[PDB]
């Protein structure tokens, strides 16, 4: 398996994310997430079911720990993160990975 | 499964670690080198018998990405890196975590 976006590559056997063909050091939760973003591009995931799907369905904490984890997706993967290209926010609903070719 | 060494907390299903209450961001790698070393605790582990079992049996990369690992992980979870009392060098041979 390889996810191909952009400039983003996913390695999920591997758990490695690279940008333009440099490793990113990420989190294992972070990871997680963006693999999860990757793998269901152009759809939109609210806080609640990105916490149930990413986290687990056992998992009960608060919501902004979705947030707080986009956040340094966006500070470790984005060239411009108040302008992102991959990890969007869909305002008032969720978040999700752009798509492209 | 729930991992108490020192000051340390090890959350294996929940993949996290905490140093005195507070989670320490690590990478996935570092997670799990430092899982093992701590279900493993004095026993001494070479850096190529580490890359097999953290990284795979399927990993043929170079044994430096451990020692990498392993100053990243001092970085994040020791208070004094140059002076360690978690992740332990056995000069020559390998890494372990201190038994306590």
Known sequence: PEIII????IL???FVAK????????THREFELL???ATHTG??????HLLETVWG????GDVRT??????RLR?????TPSRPEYILTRRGVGYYMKSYD
């Open 75 to 79: 500070e470790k993967i984005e060239d």
């Open 35 to 37: 693999h999860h973003l």
């Open 12 to 14: 999920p056997d591997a």
């Open 6 to 9: 952009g400039d983003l590559q």
């Open 66 to 71: 979705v947030d707080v984890t986009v956040r």
């Open 43 to 48: 759809q939109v995931m609210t806080r609640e």
């Open 19 to 26: 940008k333009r063909g440099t490793e990113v050091e990420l």
């Open 57 to 60: 369905y056992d998992y009960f």
